[PDB]
Design a protein around this ligand. Structure first.
Ligand SMILES: CNC(=O)COc1cccc(Nc2cc(Cl)ccn2)c1
Ligand SMILES: CNC(=O)COc1cccc(Nc2cc(Cl)ccn2)c1
Lengths: 791, 235, 217, 158
């Protein structure tokens, strides 16, 4: 909402400066978005009158003018094409200081003397109109300073209103606020009733009184629509960002911006037998004044006549019913449309007007009459005509009525953290035009004015008091709490712990978009239907991720393309598995690595990262809550991973996730020429662990035996290690695979597994006989289970 | 063709913390999440901060060389973390909400007792603090700590620095786990805190005793040997 | 992590919820009527007529208010989504919302909480300004400004919003507005990070360039 | 009852490496946390701190627990060799705690973070090199600690 400060101050003058006013407005809930001067600075420019023009005897493009300043006649040479006798123009006298340090001096232009200069709006920084001289009204006061006449010592203030302050969508609204903020008198425009000159009316019918409980109609005969909009009105509308279009629209727009009442004028000739305020019939068609052909719904209030729909009520008028050049007579409308009935209706047809906005936000239900009288006087002043009587059709039963609110002083003190005096409470509420009546000790009955649509509860009254008292003047307290000692279980690996562990293990944390390209989704999740958005930002951000991997791989290759060799990234976040019915939103921890195993350095080996480097990172995460043994890495398969380098991770047979090399065929398709290692873990399956259970320490030595085992190249190492523990008896304390040999020294389809076995008895030393016995039962078990052989 | 098996991962894996450190962190967390500040102090203290300020008179057996480690007549090794609470009470005016974990020392020699150990003490000093406030705090602490809605018993006991005082028991037919009480008026008065305006409660517990209860540790001597076969069990 | 720590040290619990929410939890329960422009497809991402991508973390606070009776002290960090996309705005971002519901909560309690939070967060005894604003879910409401002490290049900056929980919001979640009062606040994590670290372009947050990320080790 | 409190949001500065953070980093870097007696043998004290007079107890528990430590190293080395004597080869320990520097008048009680390592660089495994730990392995651990609060460049190894 934009407005002229001069115009606002003409209603309520706060006796503070512009800067003080702009500062306070934001501080009381009217956030100022802009405060700008209406024009450039200048001096010595007065209203001048061209008495005569003659042709310059030595320059055809120039005229020799005789111009009066009301005191004296000056000869001025003008080149502007519009310069002519009778014209009221800005006269810059010798001495005048124009913008960009342009001082007016005496001149002898092509042998002719010139004692000043006549100005364009552009030359004065008024408008960008350099087309010619700024033509002033025929009745301009000649001699008066142009800045005074054109009210150029002014600012336009733009306020970004909150949806609850629909009442401030007018100068009347804003001025009432200022009067409250500053506790100053409010002088609203005195609107005298315009007396009817005839008895011509048109009937009005409220066929939907709940959507329109009040409608005012008025006949204005023999209007001259060729007449211009006066300058004072053009400037007031312009200073509110309203472009002047035609006299009648200009008046209705002006009345709306001045008082807050949207209005509309129809061509009376286009009204067939009186107005009918009703709902549209389903599929009823109306062409708007902007050419748009709308197909209406039965939920929409229209202004119709007895033949057809004329306008979409409170939003926009029709082309046919509207004023044109051929219009000789008007039918003015000022109505109240219920906010609820109008809510989102313009938006549903793809429309938004100054009228729709004001009616949806709320227009004072009592305002129509004052606005009608105001618009009548303005129409008669601007375009002439003869007014008939006002036809007021009202439905007393459907007029908005807000029950009085009881406000308790103790509820104000509680909320504000301090007490306000009864006199301050009353003064503040009365300034906002609320009706305050005492209802005993520390209690009032407060009535809501017809322009306020945001006040229905006691808490809304407290907001009004806090707002006007000053938020920053209120006390500061810290909330009280009866707090008790508490903690989460000890044996749990939380995500903040896990992130820091991955950081320590040389990972950088990535954050990727949860919605990805369906094409990318399909590469990582073949045959699965993604949970697709109905209104995606773009088509490549349509699919909800079922893995953190497409995003992680894409961020990885983003870096690979930016001269990075070693990319080690991790991400946590949700997965979206299934369609709406049965959707699973599970938190995941996923990681992606590539390049050298170690960062480049004098002391570091130059080997490339592999599966077992990623495996160690997964192992470290899985052991974070002392539950590593609860997990198992089983040879598995995933469509995004290499089937020869993929481990399916489980806990009690339940799937935790996968770990593996990104499938070389996926890499080809993405143009990734480096091996990439991925893991993804379901955090709900990783978080729980076990609390330490102390096992007694032996005062006795431990015994170690090393076994070199020949097994088939394909039998899994953990199957052999598991069998060993099973056959090693009660005293095994450690089992270590210290080497794997797949060389020439043995069969090409076999492998040597060098294992170290440690035993410790809790109460004695272990003898060689029993340890050799235990060792032989391990061997025998491995012969009968995997056809193993000692090296 | 380029298939491999799922053998152990390459490199270094995680070590771990000491069970006492795990326990201290846990006790602190129960209070720090509700406004308590972690306060630390010196381990080499004076008679005043360690004894006098805590209403322990000069002739009290606790002060003797049979129980307290001395450097000279006035300088000692702190027998508790209460001197830290004393230094806090001197430095500031109420409200005070602090938890004091730390190394403490006692002469008492072998088996059930080590010459060095850890304890966590607490202190809350405010305008209207009651014994009811203390009971609630302690009961909810033990429940949070042991992760069970266990039964908590308060037995009247005695400490020179508190009045009334209590020994706190939990089930498993009961086990004494800590001590507490309302800060003695003379303790506040000595640290320039008006006992008429301010009331306070304080509590104390042994970290090793708690760790033993939690992890099933039998011998308290295992805590200071640093055997990897012991330490490794707390990863 | 830092925003959570300022509150978790004083009794606030970390609450999390789903990112795919329903109209009720995301809008209806927060006093946002069906005809409200926030609900439109120009701002909100939809799967069908009732299922959407949460526009804020407030649905988590709603799910908490339904599940339990006061006292409630929660902080809700998370990924949130909005249709508005270009420079200055991303379709996905992070925000932290807070909620305290107890027997005697005032606007003074809220001012104190917010002022001390911003001071703790920015590690400065900065000036905090409260401007009256509007939100459907709070009354009274405020936009919170801080001084330009943490610059615009590394005399006020808007950093967050707050207000007293609307009676209809509590009532809808079976909490008597006569017995219980509450306050709630919200902030953008990216906006805060930019203020803290001197980050100029918000788009750098979702590119994951190592030359960017590495600067925060 | 539960005590009432007017609590305010608060936090420590962001850019700080606290000891709980450092311990966990050393844990991640393959260290086991040790807790050793603050009072050591004066003979052991003299080996690590030649010429310094230890702050000696008047009534020590035993004569080999008479000296207040000026370093966490004698305790760390002793715990290390305790393990070496108990069939351990790879011992990686860290400890935090006070040091006691000076006599009563002018005594300094400063918190330290100390570490001690020996044996193979990596734990025994099929995929791991069999090299022994050296200076540069310990250097990396110190570097990682020193970089914990984004101030690595503020330090220098001379
Ligand atoms: C194993 N340690 C225990 O049982 C310790 O017990 C208690 C019991 C009660 C209070 C305290 N501390 C305390 C501290 C001050 Cl500054 C004032 C008053 N009291 C310690
Ligand atoms: C990014 N967010 C902002 O700038 C401001 O957010 C705000 C402001 C005020 C309140 C809230 N949240 C809320 C939630 C419930 Cl359940 C009830 C009431 N309010 C969020």
């Amino acid at each position: 909402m934009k407005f002229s400060e001069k115009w606002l101050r003409s209603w309520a003058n706060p006796q503070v400066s512009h800067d003080e006013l702009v500062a306070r407005l934001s501080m009381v809930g009217l956030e100022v978005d802009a405060d700008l001067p209406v024009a450039g600075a200048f001096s010595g420019v007065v209203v001048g009158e061209v008495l005569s023009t003659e042709q310059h005897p030595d320059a055809d493009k120039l005229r020799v003018c005789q111009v009066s300043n009301g005191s004296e006649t000056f000869q001025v040479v003008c080149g502007a094409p519009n310069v002519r006798a009778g014209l009221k123009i800005p006269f810059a006298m010798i001495g005048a200081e124009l913008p960009d340090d342009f001082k007016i001096k005496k001149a002898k232009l092509r042998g002719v003397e010139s004692f000043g200069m006549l100005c364009s709006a552009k030359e004065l920084q008024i408008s960008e109109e350099n087309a010619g001289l700024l033509e002033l009204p025929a009745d301009a006061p000649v001699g008066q300073d142009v800045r005074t006449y054109l009210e150029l010592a002014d600012y336009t203030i733009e306020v970004g209103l909150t949806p609850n302050r629909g009442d401030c969508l007018s100068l009347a609204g804003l001025a009432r606020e200022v009067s409250a903020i500053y506790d100053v008198p409010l002088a609203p425009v005195a609107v005298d009733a315009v007396a009817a000159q005839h008895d011509e009316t048109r009937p009005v019918e409220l066929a939907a009184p709940a959507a329109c409980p009040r409608y005012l109609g008025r006949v204005i005969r023999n209007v001259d629509l060729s007449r211009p909009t006066p300058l004072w009105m053009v400037e007031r509308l312009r200073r509110s960002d309203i472009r002047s279009i035609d006299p009648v629209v200009d008046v209705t727009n002006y009345v709306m911006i001045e008082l807050g009442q949207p209005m509309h004028a129809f061509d009376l000739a286009e009204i067939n037998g009186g107005v009918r305020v009703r709902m549209a019939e389903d599929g009823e068609k109306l062409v708007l004044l902007d050419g748009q052909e709308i197909t209406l719904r039965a939920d929409t209030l229209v202004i119709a006549d007895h033949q057809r729909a004329l306008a979409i009520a409170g939003v926009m008028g029709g082309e046919h019913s509207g004023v044109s050049d051929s219009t000789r007579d008007l039918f003015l409308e000022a109505a109240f449309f219920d906010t609820i009935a109008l809510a989102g209706k313009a938006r549903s047809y793809g429309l938004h007007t100054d009228s729709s906005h004001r009616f949806e936000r709320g227009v004072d239900s009592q305002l129509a009459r004052k606005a009608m009288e105001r618009a009548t006087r303005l129409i008669l002043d601007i375009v002439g005509g003869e007014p008939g009587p006002i036809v007021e059709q009202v439905s007393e039963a459907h007029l908005p009525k807000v029950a009085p609110i009881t406000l308790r002083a103790e509820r104000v003190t509680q909320m504000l953290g301090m007490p306000l005096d009864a006199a301050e409470i009353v003064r503040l509420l009365q300034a906002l035009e609320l009706t305050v009546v005492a209802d005993g000790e520390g209690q009032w009955s407060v009535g809501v004015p017809s322009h306020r649509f945001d006040i229905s509860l006691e808490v809304d009254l407290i907001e009004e008091l806090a707002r006007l008292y000053g938020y920053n003047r209120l006390p500061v307290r810290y909330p009280q709490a009866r707090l008790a000692p508490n903690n989460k279980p000890e044996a749990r690996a939380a995500l903040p712990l896990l992130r820091r562990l991955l950081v320590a293990r040389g990972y950088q944390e990535a954050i990727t978009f949860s919605f990805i390209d369906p094409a990318l989704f399909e590469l990582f999740d073949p045959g699965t239907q993604p949970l697709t958005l109905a209104n995606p930002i773009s088509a490549d951000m349509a699919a909800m991720r079922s893995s953190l991997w497409p995003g992680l791989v894409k961020a990885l290759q983003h870096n690979l393309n930016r001269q990075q060799s070693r990319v080690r990234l991790f991400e946590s976040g949700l997965r979206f598995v299934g369609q709406l019915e049965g959707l699973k939103q599970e938190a995941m921890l996923a990681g992606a690595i590539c390049g050298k195993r170690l960062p480049e350095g004098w002391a570091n080996g130059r080997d490339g990262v592999d599966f077992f480097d990623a495996k160690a990172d997964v192992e470290a995460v899985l052991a974070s809550a002392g539950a590593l043994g609860d997990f198992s890495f089983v040879p598995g398969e995933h469509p995004a991973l290499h089937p020869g380098q993929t481990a399916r991770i489980e806990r009690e047979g339940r799937l935790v996730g996968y770990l593996g090399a990104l499938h070389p065929e996926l890499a080809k398709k993405l143009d990734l020429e480096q091996p990439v290692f991925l893991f993804e873990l379901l955090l709900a399956e990783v978080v729980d662990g076990h609390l330490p259970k102390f096992r007694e320490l032996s005062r006795f030595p431990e015994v170690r035996r090393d076994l070199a085992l020949l097994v088939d190249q394909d039998v899994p190492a953990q199957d052999i290690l598991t069998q060993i523990r099973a056959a090693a008896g009660e005293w095994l304390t450690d089992l270590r695979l210290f080497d794997v040999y797949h060389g020439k020294g043995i069969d090409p389809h076999r492998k040597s597994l060098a294992v170290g076995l440690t035993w410790q008895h809790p109460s004695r030393t272990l003898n060689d006989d029993e340890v050799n016995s235990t060792t032989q039962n391990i061997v025998t078990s491995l012969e009968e289970r995997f056809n193993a052989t000692l090296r | 063709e380029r298939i491999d098996v799922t053998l152990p991962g390459r490199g270094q894996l995680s070590g771990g913390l000491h069970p006492v450190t795990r326990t201290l962190e846990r006790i602190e967390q129960c209070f720090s999440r509700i406004g308590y500040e972690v306060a630390e102090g010196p381990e080499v203290e004076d008679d005043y901060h360690n004894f006098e300020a805590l209403n322990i008179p000069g002739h009290h057996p606790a002060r003797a060389m049979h129980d307290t480690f001395y450097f000279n007549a006035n300088m000692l090794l702190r027998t508790h973390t209460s001197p830290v609470q004393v230094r806090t009470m001197e430095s500031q005016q109420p409200p005070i909400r602090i938890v004091c974990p730390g190394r403490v020392y006692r002469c008492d020699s072998d088996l059930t007792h080590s010459p060095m150990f850890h304890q966590v003490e607490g202190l809350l000093v405010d305008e209207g603090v009651s014994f009811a406030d203390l009971k609630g705090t302690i009961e909810e602490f033990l429940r949070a700590f042991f992760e069970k809605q266990l039964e908590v018993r308060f037995r009247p006991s005695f400490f020179p620095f508190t009045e009334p005082s209590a020994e706190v028991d939990i089930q498993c037919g009961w086990l004494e786990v800590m001590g507490c009480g309302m800060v003695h008026p003379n303790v506040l008065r000595m640290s320039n805190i008006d006992p008429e305006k301010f009331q306070g409660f304080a509590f104390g517990m042994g970290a090793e005793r708690l760790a033993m209860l939690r992890y099933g540790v039998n011998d308290l001597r295992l805590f200071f040997d640093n055997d990897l076969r012991f330490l490794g069990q707390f990863r | 992590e830092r925003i959570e720590q300022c509150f978790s040290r004083i009794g606030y619990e970390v609450a999390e919820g789903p990112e795919v929410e329903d109209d009720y939890h995301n809008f209806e329960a927060l006093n946002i009527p069906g005809h409200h422009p926030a609900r439109a497809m120009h701002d909100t991402f939809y799967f069908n007529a009732n299922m959407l991508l949460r526009t804020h973390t407030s649905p988590v606070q709603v799910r908490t208010m339904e599940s339990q009776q006061p006292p409630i002290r929660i902080v809700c960090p998370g990924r949130v989504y909005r249709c508005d996309s270009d420079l200055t705005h991303s379709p996905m971002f992070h925000q932290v919302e807070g909620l305290l519901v107890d027997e005697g909560v005032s606007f003074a309690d809220l001012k104190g909480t917010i002022e001390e939070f911003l001071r703790a967060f920015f590690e400065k005894q900065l000036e905090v300004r409260f401007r009256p604003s509007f939100f459907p879910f709070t009354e009274p409401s405020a936009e919170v400004d801080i001084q330009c002490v943490i610059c615009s290049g590394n005399g006020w900056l808007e950093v967050m919003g707050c207000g007293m929980v609307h009676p209809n919001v509590l009532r809808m979640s079976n909490i008597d507005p006569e017995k219980f009062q509450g306050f709630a606040f919200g902030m953008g994590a990216e906006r805060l990070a930019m203020l803290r670290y001197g980050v100029n372009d918000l788009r750098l947050f979702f590119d994951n360039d190592l030359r960017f990320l590495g600067q925060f080790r």
